[PDB]
Design a protein around this ligand. Structure first.
Ligand SMILES: *[C@@H]1O[C@H](CO)[C@@H](O)[C@H](O)[C@H]1NC(C)=O
Ligand SMILES: *[C@@H]1O[C@H](CO)[C@@H](O)[C@H](O)[C@H]1NC(C)=O
Ligand SMILES: *[C@@H]1O[C@H](CO)[C@@H](O)[C@H](O)[C@H]1NC(C)=O
Ligand SMILES: *[C@@H]1O[C@H](CO)[C@@H](O)[C@H](O)[C@H]1NC(C)=O
Ligand SMILES: *[C@@H]1O[C@H](CO)[C@@H](O)[C@H](O)[C@H]1NC(C)=O
Ligand SMILES: *[C@@H]1O[C@H](CO)[C@@H](O)[C@H](O)[C@H]1NC(C)=O
Ligand SMILES: *[C@@H]1O[C@H](CO)[C@@H](O)[C@H](O)[C@H]1NC(C)=O
Ligand SMILES: *[C@@H]1O[C@H](CO)[C@@H](O)[C@H](O)[C@H]1NC(C)=O
Ligand SMILES: *[C@@H]1O[C@H](CO)[C@@H](O)[C@H](O)[C@H]1NC(C)=O
Ligand SMILES: *[C@@H]1O[C@H](CO)[C@@H](O)[C@H](O)[C@H]1NC(C)=O
Ligand SMILES: *[C@@H]1O[C@H](CO)[C@@H](O)[C@H](O)[C@H]1NC(C)=O
Ligand SMILES: *[C@@H]1O[C@H](CO)[C@@H](O)[C@H](O)[C@H]1NC(C)=O
Lengths: 206, 367, 413, 99, 49
């Protein structure tokens, strides 16, 4: 199954305050009104980068795995919420053929009623996580609206990724593409509106 | 950077003549402003009591609660809205511009065309308007017999300027475009500092850090070549733009002299209709004229003739046109219907009936 | 000199550009954390035979090496690829400490691409190796009565090692007609052999304990780095500055702005940086350029006088009689409380003149005499008399007809 | 030599561009001078402050190096009295206005 | 050519300001034509006689 992304999947692209201004930027973004895949857990491709989101009230998702093989021969990301903090490791995991839960390692780190939204990308050997959380009233779909995802971590992993999988009651996956966006910063320096310049001729005009 | 400064000296006089060109622009902006507003020798000021015969200038005269701008000038100021770059002040402040427009305006109301020709000579405003009606071929009694209506039509027409300029900025697009063109030029000049022009980096100290002495100079000379072409392009563009503003300031200085200080007989120069007078108001980077004009507004068809024949003599109107109401013949002034009986005073003779194509037979009265 | 002239006419002339120079340098960086354990690693419990040299890996920490040469405890010290005093500034993808025991005559061998039986048969280093040998005499520990035979090195090989070729092969080296059969004898030898360390040995035979630091930088980004200094935070003065690697020249000032927790820099509409968060005490600083502007000289012309006044255009007088105009700081002219017609322009309604004991004066220009026109609703003024007036008006009509021969200006002959 | 060609060519392009813009300022002044000779000298202008200050009587052309000088002759009213005034006068029940 | 175009980007705003300048020339020709001829609000027509 698939669902419309609407105007969601924008994130703060850089560590810069800007205010009362419209800023043009070129980066990997989820294009406006693109369809995204919907789920109620295959190994997915990673492509250039990923938008991941879920509708939640129960905390049934617990993490993700990322890599090239996602298996044994090389170092690979394990990300888990331990029900107290986020925990991250990059080990050469001889992992099982599917997720499991309590229900060599070069590096490690430690930190329906809601939407949880995330973006994952890897550039020049740094893995980026951005996220946002909000209450919701809609059941089946990504809520038509706008808010921007903020950086959580910026990890110097030095590791490649081409595939990933979910660890875990409904969730969505879409892919970033190289796009030009115009982003509106208000007087508090938050992004409050956006335009996907290639969407249609009015978006080019704006 | 001293390492760049020593390379820039090899290009010689180029850097000096850019300042000389921009200084020629900057000095001229004060000359453009001076020659528009400073046409008045003395700061004339209004009587304390506003006895202008029903005409109401309170919207365009100074307000002491306002800078001393008029009410309409305060609307006009609301509707218009660093790497070695500097902006310089104008010589005349916005308060001095508003004192010149005050003097031009109070001279015009209290003394008519006379303060342009020499000393201001007072005349009552209703009589000044009566002699501005003679300038358009309408006899002065047409004003005094209609003075209350002519005053209401003027007061109402100024009220529509307040509503128009309160409700939309769109009329000020000429002044706002001059702000926008100067902003777009400086935004471009500054953003051209980030460009490489083929150098390894656009950051000058980054070139000095990455490279050895002689290798760096060959890359710094690319930033010098591109930044010099970038600044020459901006100065050449401002010279072409200043020549367009100077042509507009020479036109504004001409409308100050001919529309405000006088009464122009030039068609469509001081607005459409037959010109009576106009009032200057200041605006950011420009001038606004309120051109007051007589427009004829209701009409009837009349039968007409080039001349009338009395006892063999062909009579022509001195100052007027002959017309018939269907059964009688009259002479009128041309720009307002006011019939008079045809007489030996209203007309002049020239020869027998037979020469004129279309003459008519009627009695000329001899008082 | 600006005019290339000995006579100067009445006017205002721009002669120079003023510029406030950076008075000092500010540096600001994060609070320092996670110092690398080198002083504990140099006190490790264990050592290895040099054919099986032992490596400890170092990552995710900030590095100081200065103790390793500021302390005279080490009987030998050498460094390669980088100078020992510079290492405390630098960054690496990986760091390692490599450990072994050998006789004092062989510690000299351990160098980038160099020869000697320990380098050539036990611990070979590449020609681009970056690292330091730190070593100390251990004759009090590693030597034994009757000799210590627990330490071994490779004495025999058919050819020299490649970089980090940790060869632990052990078959008999045959040196003649004797077949090997895994046993030593006449012209047949085990490839690993011992120094036999005795406490009575001479200093070239005596054992040294060695730690060689080894440093590595790759396509993957750094995990070990040097610490950094920081200064007092000097507001309201012109400085050079650096925050977390954002360099510039300016005056730093307090601000009302509220950067989100991840935001570190603030930018103007032209992308030009105009605020920063301090990394140590999280105030937001507005950045403003150090002041600059044209210097102009006001002169009544040298035909009349040699006095001058000078205008620092757009400058505040704090930054340079002295008078603050809205056009900039004016020096050498009196502020006069009268008003006159504009003799020499300055800006924003200010003009200057030379007048009466004479001095240069600066005043707000007067637009003309005030005049109440004697208006009344029944009074008229009529002229009794006239004057014929003759006015001169002058207009330019044509330039001098220059023409330039482009190939003779550019080249010629 | 190609550095000297590139710089001397840009130095000459800059001069010719300044002369093209400057000659257009002199053309605007030459068109104004041609207009003042038609309107002020060959006629009698009624355009206020066009042919000098005061009411224009006539003007005379004099040549000068690279230009023209106009001597504008004008009437300026010079001494005045106040008078009482009225827009009309009333006679045998009827209003008279000045012709 | 893309191999040339990616070098031309290193010159920054020179191309954008040339396209903007010639568009300024081009729009002004339609302004000039309306200033001269469009001085009349109604299409007046001569009578048949
Ligand atoms: C994988 O990582 C290595 C790290 O050196 C890099 O050389 C390589 O380009 C990456 N990509 C692939 C597809 O191997
Ligand atoms: C900026 O944030 C403050 C609270 O920190 C708020 O009072 C203010 O209204 C915000 N500004 C805007 C334009 O919303
Ligand atoms: C002029 O207009 C104001 C209101 O705009 C009014 O109060 C005043 O009485 C008027 N005066 C005359 C002379 O009409
Ligand atoms: C004048 O005559 C024509 C022809 O009879 C008629 O169309 C028109 O309405 C009349 N009135 C005016 C004001 O033109
Ligand atoms: C024409 O003028 C005479 C003037 O006395 C008047 O009596 C008559 O009513 C007027 N109108 C017509 C249609 O004749
Ligand atoms: C107008 O035209 C008619 C018919 O051609 C002619 O009889 C008449 O003389 C002309 N002139 C006048 C004033 O009617
Ligand atoms: C006008 O009057 C003359 C005599 O004065 C006469 O001959 C002529 O026929 C008259 N014309 C008309 C149209 O009545
Ligand atoms: C940095 O350390 C100093 C001294 O302990 C402390 O005052 C300051 O608040 C610390 N800053 C941060 C952001 O932790
Ligand atoms: C000049 O600078 C001083 C010191 O910052 C300040 O007190 C003063 O208000 C400034 N005046 C002007 C007009 O800038
Ligand atoms: C100028 O005049 C004002 C008002 O009387 C006064 O405050 C000031 O002290 C005078 N002197 C100077 C040099 O400004
Ligand atoms: C008019 O002015 C002239 C000088 O311009 C003088 O000779 C003459 O006497 C004056 N006449 C009167 C009536 O003032
Ligand atoms: C006209 O009369 C007024 C009021 O008495 C007086 O102020 C003014 O100076 C007089 N003007 C002339 C030219 O006599």
């Amino acid at each position: 199954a698939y669902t419309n992304s609407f105007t969601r999947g924008v994130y703060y692209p850089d560590k810069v305050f800007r205010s009362s201004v419209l800023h043009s930027t070129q980066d990997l973004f989820l294009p406006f009104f693109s369809n995204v895949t919907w789920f109620h857990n295959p190994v997915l491709p990673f492509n250039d980068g990923v938008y991941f989101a879920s509708t939640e009230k129960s905390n049934i998702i617990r993490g993700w795995i990322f890599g090239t093989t996602l298996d044994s021969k090389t170092q690979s990301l394990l990300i888990v919420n331990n029900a107290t903090n986020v925990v991250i490791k990059v080990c050469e995991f001889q992992f099982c053929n599917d997720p499991f839960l309590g229900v060599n390692c070069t590096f490690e780190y430690v930190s329906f009623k809601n939407l949880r939204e995330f973006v994952f990308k890897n550039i020049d050997g740094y893995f980026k996580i951005y996220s946002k959380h909000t209450p919701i009233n809609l059941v089946r779909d990504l809520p038509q609206g706008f808010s921007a995802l903020e950086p959580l971590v910026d990890l110097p992993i030095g590791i490649n990724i081409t595939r990933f999988q979910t660890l875990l009651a409904a969730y969505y996956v879409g892919y970033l593409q190289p796009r030009t966006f115009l982003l509106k910063y208000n007087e508090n320096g938050t992004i409050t509106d956006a335009v996907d310049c290639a969407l249609d001729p009015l978006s080019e005009t704006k | 950077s001293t390492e760049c400064s020593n390379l820039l000296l090899q290009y010689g006089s180029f850097c000096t003549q850019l300042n000389r060109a921009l200084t020629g622009i900057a000095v001229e902006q004060d000359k453009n402003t001076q020659e528009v507003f400073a046409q008045v020798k003395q700061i004339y000021k209004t009587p304390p009591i506003k006895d202008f015969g029903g005409f109401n200038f309170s919207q365009i005269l100074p307000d002491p609660s306002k800078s001393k701008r008029s009410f309409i000038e305060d609307l006009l100021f609301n509707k218009v809205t660093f790497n070695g770059l500097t902006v310089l002040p104008p010589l005349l402040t916005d308060e001095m511009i508003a004192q010149y427009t005050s003097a031009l305006l109070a001279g015009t109301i209290t003394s008519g065309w006379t303060f342009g020709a020499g000393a201001a000579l007072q005349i009552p405003f209703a009589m000044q308007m009566a002699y501005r009606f003679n300038g358009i071929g309408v006899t002065q009694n047409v004003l005094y017999e209609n003075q209350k209506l002519i005053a209401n039509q003027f007061n109402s027409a100024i009220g529509k300027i307040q509503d128009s300029l309160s409700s939309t900025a769109s009329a000020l697009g000429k002044l706002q475009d001059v702000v926008n063109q100067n902003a777009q030029a400086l935004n471009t000049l500054v953003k051209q500092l980030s460009s490489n022009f083929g150098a390894i980096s656009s950051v000058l100290n980054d070139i000095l850090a990455r490279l050895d002495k002689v290798e760096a100079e060959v890359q710094i000379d690319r930033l010098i070549t591109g930044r010099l072409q970038s600044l020459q392009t901006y100065v050449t563009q401002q010279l072409i733009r200043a020549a367009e503003i100077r042509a507009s300031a020479n036109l504004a200085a001409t409308k100050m002299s001919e529309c405000v200080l006088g009464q122009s007989k030039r068609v469509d120069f001081c607005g459409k209709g037959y010109h009576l007078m106009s009032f200057p108001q200041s605006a950011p980077h420009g001038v606004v004229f309120l051109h007051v004009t007589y427009v004829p507004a209701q009409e009837k068809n009349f039968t007409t003739a080039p001349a009338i024949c009395h006892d063999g003599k062909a009579h022509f109107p001195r100052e007027g046109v002959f017309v018939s109401n269907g059964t009688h013949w009259f002479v009128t002034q041309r720009n307002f219907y006011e019939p008079q009986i045809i007489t030996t005073h209203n007309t002049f003779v020239s020869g027998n009936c037979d020469v004129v194509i279309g003459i008519v037979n009627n009695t000329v009265y001899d008082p | 000199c600006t005019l290339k002239s000995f006579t100067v006419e009445k006017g205002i002339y721009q002669t120079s550009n003023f510029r406030v120079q950076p008075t000092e340098s500010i540096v600001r960086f994060p609070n320092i954390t996670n110092l690398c354990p080198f002083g504990e690693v140099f006190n490790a419990t264990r050592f290895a035979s040099v054919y099986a040299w032992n490596r400890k890996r170092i990552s995710n920490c900030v590095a100081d090496y200065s103790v390793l040469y500021n302390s005279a405890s080490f009987s030998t010290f050498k460094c390669y690829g980088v100078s020992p005093t510079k290492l405390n500034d630098l960054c690496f993808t990986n760091v390692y400490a490599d450990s072994f025991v050998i006789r004092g005559d062989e510690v000299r061998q351990i160098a980038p691409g160099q020869t000697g039986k320990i380098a050539d048969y036990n611990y070979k280093l590449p020609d681009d190796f970056t690292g330091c040998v730190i070593a100390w005499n251990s004759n009090n520990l590693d030597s034994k009565v009757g000799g210590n035979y627990n330490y071994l090195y490779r004495l025999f090989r058919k050819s020299n090692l490649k970089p980090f070729e940790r060869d632990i092969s052990t078959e008999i080296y045959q040196a003649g007609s004797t077949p090997c059969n895994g046993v030593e004898g006449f012209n047949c030898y085990f490839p690993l052999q011992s120094y036999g360390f005795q406490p009575t040995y001479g200093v070239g035979y005596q054992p040294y304990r060695v730690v060689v630091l080894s440093f590595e930088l790759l396509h993957a980004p750094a995990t070990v780095c040097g610490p950094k200094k920081s200064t007092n935070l000097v507001k309201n003065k012109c400085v050079n500055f650096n925050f977390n690697g954002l360099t510039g020249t300016g005056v730093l000032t307090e601000s009302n702005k509220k950067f989100l927790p991840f935001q570190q820099f603030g930018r103007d509409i032209d992308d030009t940086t105009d605020a920063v968060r301090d990394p140590q005490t999280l105030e937001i600083l507005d950045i403003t350029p150090c002041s600059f502007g044209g210097v102009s000289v006001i002169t009544p012309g040298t035909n009349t006088s040699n006095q001058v006044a000078v205008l620092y255009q757009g400058v505040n007088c704090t930054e340079v009689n002295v008078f603050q105009t809205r056009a900039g700081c004016l020096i050498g002219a009196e502020h006069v409380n009268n008003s006159y017609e504009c003799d020499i322009p300055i800006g924003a309604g200010i003009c200057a003149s030379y007048q009466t004991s004479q001095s240069i004066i600066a005043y707000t220009m007067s637009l003309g005499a005030e005049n109440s026109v004697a208006y009344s609703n029944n009074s008229i003024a009529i002229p009794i008399n006239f004057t014929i007036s003759v006015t001169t008006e002058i207009l330019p009509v044509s330039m001098t007809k220059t023409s330039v021969d482009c190939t003779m200006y550019i080249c010629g002959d």
